[PDB]
Amino acid sequence: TTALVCDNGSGLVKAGFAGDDAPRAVFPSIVGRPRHQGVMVGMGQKDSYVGDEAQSKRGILTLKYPIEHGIITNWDDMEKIWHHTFYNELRVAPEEHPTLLTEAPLNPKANREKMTQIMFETFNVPAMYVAIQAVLSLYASGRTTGIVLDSGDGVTHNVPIYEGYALPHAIMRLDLAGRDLTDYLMKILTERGYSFVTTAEREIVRDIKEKLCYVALDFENEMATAASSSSLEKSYELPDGQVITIGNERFRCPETLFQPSFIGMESAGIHETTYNSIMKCDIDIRKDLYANNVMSGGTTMYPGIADRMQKEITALAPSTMKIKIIAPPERKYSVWIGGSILASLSTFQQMWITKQEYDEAGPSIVHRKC
Amino acid sequence: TTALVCDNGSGLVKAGFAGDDAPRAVFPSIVGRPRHQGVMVGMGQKDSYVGDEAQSKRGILTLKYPIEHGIITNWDDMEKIWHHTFYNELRVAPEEHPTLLTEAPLNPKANREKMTQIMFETFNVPAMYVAIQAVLSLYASGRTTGIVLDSGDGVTHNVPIYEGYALPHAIMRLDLAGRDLTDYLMKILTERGYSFVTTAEREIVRDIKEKLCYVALDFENEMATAASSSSLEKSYELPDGQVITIGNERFRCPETLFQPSFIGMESAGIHETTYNSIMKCDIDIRKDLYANNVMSGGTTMYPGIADRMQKEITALAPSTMKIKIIAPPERKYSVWIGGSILASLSTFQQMWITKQEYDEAGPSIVHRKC
Amino acid sequence: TTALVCDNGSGLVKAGFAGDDAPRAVFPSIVGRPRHQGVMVGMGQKDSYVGDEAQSKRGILTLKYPIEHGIITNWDDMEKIWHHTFYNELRVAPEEHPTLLTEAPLNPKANREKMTQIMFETFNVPAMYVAIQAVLSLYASGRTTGIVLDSGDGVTHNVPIYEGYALPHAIMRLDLAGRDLTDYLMKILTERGYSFVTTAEREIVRDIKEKLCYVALDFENEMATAASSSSLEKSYELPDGQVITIGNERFRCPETLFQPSFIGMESAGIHETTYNSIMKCDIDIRKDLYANNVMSGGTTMYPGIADRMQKEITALAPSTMKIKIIAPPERKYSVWIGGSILASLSTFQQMWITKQEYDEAGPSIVHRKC
Amino acid sequence: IDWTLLEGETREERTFRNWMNSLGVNPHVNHLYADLQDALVILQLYERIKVPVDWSKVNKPPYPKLGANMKKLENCNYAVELGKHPAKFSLVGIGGQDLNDGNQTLTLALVWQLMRR
Ligand SMILES: Nc1ncnc2c1ncn2[C@@H]1O[C@H](COP(=O)(O)OP(=O)(O)O)[C@@H](O)[C@H]1O
Ligand SMILES: Nc1ncnc2c1ncn2[C@@H]1O[C@H](COP(=O)(O)OP(=O)(O)O)[C@@H](O)[C@H]1O
Ligand SMILES: Nc1ncnc2c1ncn2[C@@H]1O[C@H](COP(=O)(O)OP(=O)(O)O)[C@@H](O)[C@H]1O
Ligand SMILES: [Mg+2]
Numbered sequence A, B, C: 001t002t003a004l005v006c007d008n009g010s011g012l013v014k015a016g017f018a019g020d021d022a023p024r025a026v027f028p029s030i031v032g033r034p035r036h037q038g039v040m041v042g043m044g045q046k047d048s049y050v051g052d053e054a055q056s057k058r059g060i061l062t063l064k065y066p067i068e069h070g071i072i073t074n075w076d077d078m079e080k081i082w083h084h085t086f087y088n089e090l091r092v093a094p095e096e097h098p099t100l101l102t103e104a105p106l107n108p109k110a111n112r113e114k115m116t117q118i119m120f121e122t123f124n125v126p127a128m129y130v131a132i133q134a135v136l137s138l139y140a141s142g143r144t145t146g147i148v149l150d151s152g153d154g155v156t157h158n159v160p161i162y163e164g165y166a167l168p169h170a171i172m173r174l175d176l177a178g179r180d181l182t183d184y185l186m187k188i189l190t191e192r193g194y195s196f197v198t199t200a201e202r203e204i205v206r207d208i209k210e211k212l213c214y215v216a217l218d219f220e221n222e223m224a225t226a227a228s229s230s231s232l233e234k235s236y237e238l239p240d241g242q243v244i245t246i247g248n249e250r251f252r253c254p255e256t257l258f259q260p261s262f263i264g265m266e267s268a269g270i271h272e273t274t275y276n277s278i279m280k281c282d283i284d285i286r287k288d289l290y291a292n293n294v295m296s297g298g299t300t301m302y303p304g305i306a307d308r309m310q311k312e313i314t315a316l317a318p319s320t321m322k323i324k325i326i327a328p329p330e331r332k333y334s335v336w337i338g339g340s341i342l343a344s345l346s347t348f349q350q351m352w353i354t355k356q357e358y359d360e361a362g363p364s365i366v367h368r369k370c
Numbered sequence D: 001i002d003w004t005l006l007e008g009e010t011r012e013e014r015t016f017r018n019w020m021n022s023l024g025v026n027p028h029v030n031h032l033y034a035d036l037q038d039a040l041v042i043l044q045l046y047e048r049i050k051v052p053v054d055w056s057k058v059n060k061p062p063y064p065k066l067g068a069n070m071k072k073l074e075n076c077n078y079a080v081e082l083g084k085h086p087a088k089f090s091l092v093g094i095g096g097q098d099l100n101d102g103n104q105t106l107t108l109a110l111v112w113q114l115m116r117r
């Protein structure tokens, strides 16, 4: 019939048909369960909440993410999310559609085998495929050469590609992303006396982060600007109608991407990780990688992120190299868009893992076909 | 119709039509193959790179020279180069053109037989001929008496000719040329910490050699000059924008031609080899040989090479002889120029090995007719 | 009085006195600095850690190696390691002892010059000398003929010697050694979900490599063995008490020595590099080189590495040549042992660079005397 | 008929483009290295030299915004496949990415053999 493209991110689920220009269903990758006595009539009869229903009813629920750092840690809740995706948001029979899934690089092999087994046995898809998220982000930009910086909710990774060839020894991965930035914002918000401690309040802090945070082009004078003046301060309204105000935390949160030591990590920032990924590549392709720095994922949506990466890589390049960062407005769906592109190509239709292939090699067939 | 002249050097391929003043196609004699994982569909369909495209995409390719030391060591990649030069660079059907090929002296006989079999059975050219490269360099100079010093990428050889007669017993051949100077430059570049190790980096070192190396008129004085002052230092920019600086390596690289012991060889320099070739000729013709020292090939293009050879041979001559070195600016194409001159002679039209002769005597006919 | 022998490797420091049979001090070539806030009163007073104390307190420190690929990249930390060696581990005044240092071949000349200047101007040693590590390994083997394969933490190099004469044109060097194998093991450990990112975790992975890794005699059947059975699985306990298990990674790590393409390098393996070094030597001495393949350094301590080398070189040899590899148990200290032997000989006592010679020639005297 | 000369075109290039126009391909080929990138014109020429073309494998000129480069790459690969096997052309070191990227040497290597056929 037609292929399904499900980009199971850490924080959000992107799904839809191949050939469409945007995911048809975009909902949080969460499962909610009640945490209070059944004092309201009719409300206690439903034991689990999956999509936006869990988010809208989060005041009486405990929210769990089945994927952490791009790894599926709860498989039963992941199946709840997959059933919700296919039968409630897309309303399709998976037995009729080949399904294209995504994954981060340097992931455990069992994650890919278990999702292959789940699609073939629980959903009985006719065929399926697992693609690398950064490669799909390259497909979305219409390029065959360039280094991709992908940053979603759980994982930050760099993948350099030249003329359609990856350099695996130069692939970088960092377990620092949007969820870690939200947790850091939660920690620094206590300096002003705000407290957020439940999983529901974590979603509130995530909304605050997505609305008032930005990347400083220079952190030290922004720190001085916020220390002297009030012009950086902005207000936010809580669900009970209380109003909070932040000035300094707006850029101190995203600075962790460039300074992971704020959360005790020894690792270098995303700019140094990109530069080191380029320097692991062959010297004859470095000029073309410097001119093609592709940004992808929701964590790359901060205002000023591309300007700061431009400034930092320029500070690292040999000056003669023309540093270019590519940051399309659709960055939030570059992985899904690339997946719909790939699943639409006729040259790809032989690349599917069919169920018959899986019936011979088992779940390990995914390591050979993908 | 029109004869084709193909000078298959170790390093560069020179091709064109008889009667023209310069080769129409001059491309590196290399074959490149991918060395990395293809990850984007459709892009991996190309298994081989041959001409300048193997040089432009060398960052993801392993480069192989099919000829080493004037010996064709890969006959399948050699067929690829011949297919490329006939169908892509010259864009002619070989079935309609007699083809003139070149060869170094003292070469293995099977090399000449194999290229004859290839030209008559793969390309089935109507007629062909294999000529010695130094003889063509004499034709390009218009002379009929003189000793030719040919130095290309793989072989350096000396051939004395008087009144149109060769002296085969005085032909001398040295398996030291430009490629060995490149590899020695790579070896001595590490003394400053510049490391080049891949086949793609060897092309960079070759470019450095062709742009910054020169022949010292007195090696011990230039060594003392570089040991005292930096006035010999010069800089080069790498393809990623890194800048390297060399002073002393500029002339120590080409000094190996006069001192082959730098690379561990026991053989004498090119000046002594030329003098010894003259001293093997009849004493009555040595005076005319001393006045006609003809150089050819790219390795004879170093600044100061003719002045050094003039001084060295003068130091070896009986003093009463007059030493003359001939070093035309077109030295890089003297072999091809002389081959187009020879192939355009009406008297040469009966010297072609025709296919009928080959169909009777087999590939051994080339030893009789050439 | 007596000479000091200091073998400054990339990873370990070997030091002692000439005439002794083993180095008196063996400690990691590292410097550690704190990376966390001081939370215990009076413990924060120490700014840097050098020897085994940097390794034991690595949980709160960032570890730096001053030498990389046999090149001293940090000279201040190198002086810290030398001060620690002379004053803390050996507890001697360097002004009273001639000091013997070691170096790899094909190294930058400024490295040797700077360590010469450091020994004469900072430690004020009365005399010094810089020897080649492979030559000392031949001294330790009691031999004057043979090809030495030295593989330590940073550099792998081959040096052919016949009857006490080196063949410098046949010396081959590869920048692939133990540290690169550790980084590759880290990369492949993520396949099982083990993540190591901190430099202290790099030391943990190095310990895992030194305990569970081995060289397969046939890699393609070991892969099938580990794919069909868990008999190769082995367990390791982490410092927090967690236990990891590896089967396949045990031999896939050392295979990079024979297949440098695992880490994206184009270079040939150590067996082909050794064979190529022999084939650059005179055909008359090749039989003796084939019969005396000396192994040295800690990276040659893998189980089964000599059997694999004997099999691979036998596959490369003309079959008529018998292939013999000499792999003594003291391989880890052959360089230091040979240094103490050389410094003990009475014929060597004129070869010291005396400080007077350094005072009149500067640091370049080392190029003439060594 | 367009008999103009461009500012920088050789007689070989002009002959190729002239036969492009004379053969009656649907696009009016003005630049050889600018109209063949979709391989649609080359597939049309294949029909004119009696080489069969399966247009079900050919991505139509209305490319979707998503994946148009990949669709053009697929078309170039199919054109190379039809030029190597059934057309019997010597195309050493030529791949579909070369026609997609417009490599002049390899494109001329194909169009002169098209003239020959
Ligand atoms: N405009 C924005 N500004 C800052 N952060 C954002 C923005 N949009 C999304 N994010 C963050 O990016 C993450 C979601 O990105 P996404 O690429 O969907 O990750 P995943 O695919 O792993 O779910 C969340 O942490 C979210 O808070
Ligand atoms: N200006 C120059 N100075 C020094 N070396 C040169 C120069 N130009 C070319 N060369 C060298 O001469 C060789 C060029 O190839 P060529 O002389 O045609 O040999 P072949 O005929 O065997 O291919 C290469 O080794 C190249 O590096
Ligand atoms: N038994 C062993 N098995 C595997 N690797 C080892 C073993 N012993 C030492 N190594 C490795 O060898 C390297 C140290 O060897 P060494 O010769 O001391 O190098 P260097 O002299 O450059 O410090 C380290 O990478 C270490 O992990
Ligand atoms: Mg994501």
Ligand SMILES: [Mg+2]
Pocket: B008, B009, B010, B011, B151, B152, B153, B154, B297
């Ligand atoms: Mg030549």
Ligand SMILES: [Mg+2]
Pocket: C008, C009, C010, C011, C151, C152, C153, C154, C155, C297
């Ligand atoms: Mg060492």
